[PDB]
Design a protein around this ligand. Structure first.
Ligand code: ATP
Length: 152
RNA sequence: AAUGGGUAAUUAUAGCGAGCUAGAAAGCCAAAG
């Protein structure tokens, strides 16, 4: 808690610093549970649970501000079981193809052998990173919605 | 007693039965670019 209070003080809430706050949770709160007085939710960390809750809560707003509603107590608080059945979320994805054809393009008599092998598998890691972080600001979203990123 | 003859046994016994050092190096290539 003192690690939180030292870095939450001198801090600004904007898209410039929309992303340093997430690592402040994903490092510090990475092992702290959520709602410990329970019988089922024993393993959902507060770094992940706050990351998913902020991921959904933006997507309700982009689902509702496009349909044209402005009040939030009749389609959320009373029509909760209707929203439990209402399809309101996409699970997007992507798949970067041709990764090993690009990484393992090394051959005998390659003038840079291991440096190009360590660069190309890092290059496609940033490319798989930038496909995420450029789709989210083309939209109105950010790194909470990205549930995973890996090898493509 | 003379005289005629040799007869049987053993045919090697007990051990050691290989030990240690080396078990692929240097180039090409790749690296350095
Ligand atoms: N960035 C990466 N670096 C290293 N290895 C990777 C990377 N991305 C994927 N791989 C490895 O390559 C395998 C498959 O990669 P591939 O490019 O065939 O994916 P894919 O095209 O989605 O395959 P499929 O068409 O069968 O779904 C994975 O099992 C993974 O181990």
């Amino acid at each position: 808690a003192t690690r939180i209070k030292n870095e939450l003080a001198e801090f600004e809430f904007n898209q410039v610093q929309i992303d340093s706050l997430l690592n402040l949770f994903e490092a510090t709160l990475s092992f702290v549970p959520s709602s410990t007085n329970t019988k089922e939710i024993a393993d959902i960390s507060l770094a992940d649970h706050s990351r998913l809750t902020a991921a959904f809560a933006l997507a309700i707003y982009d689902y509702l501000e496009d349909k044209g509603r402005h009040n939030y107590k009749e389609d959320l608080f009373t029509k909760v079981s209707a929203f439990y059945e209402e399809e309101a979320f996409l699970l997007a994805s992507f798949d970067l193809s041709g990764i090993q054809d690009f990484i393992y393009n090394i051959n005998i008599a390659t003038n840079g052998a291991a440096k190009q092998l360590k660069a190309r598998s890092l290059y496609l890691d940033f490319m798989s990173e930038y496909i995420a972080d450029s789709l989210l600001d083309k939209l109105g979203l950010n790194r909470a919605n990205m549930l995973y990123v890996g090898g493509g």
